């Protein structure tokens, strides 16, 4: 659930700021190399706040047709820590005087 919560609020913030930047509809003359750059910029800002560990900017792609853009991406999540086990062994060694 907590992974889903982090995802839900990340995608919502992403979905919101994509409205202002591109879905404001100002023109078609802002092509797909700018959208790729904007998603890289924004992944940088979330990396600054450590909410995502890192992102492979090379593996981000954009395709545009008419007034629709299709985007692929990859994110490294903040990796969790599930289990520990400890081998505790007793030994003896002499105190002396």
């Amino acid at each position: 659930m907590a992974v889903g919560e982090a995802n839900d609020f990340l995608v919502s913030e992403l979905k919101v700021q994509l409205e202002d930047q591109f879905i404001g509809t100002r023109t078609i003359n802002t092509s797909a190399s700018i959208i790729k750059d904007f998603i890289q910029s924004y992944l940088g800002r979330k990396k600054r706040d450590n909410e995502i560990q890192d992102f492979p900017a090379e593996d981000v792609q954009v395709i545009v047709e008419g007034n629709e853009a299709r985007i692929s991406m990859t994110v490294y999540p903040i990796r969790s820590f599930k289990k520990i086990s400890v081998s505790l062994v007793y030994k003896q060694q002499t105190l002396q005087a």
């Binding site: 520990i84 086990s85 400890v86 081998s87």
Partner: peptide, 25 residues
Amino acid sequence: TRPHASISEKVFCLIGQAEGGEPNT
């Protein structure tokens, strides 16, 4: 599988005859 707790450079080789382990590994 639930989250729980409970309580040098020069590599070296050895080869010889003893009891145990898979053959030829």
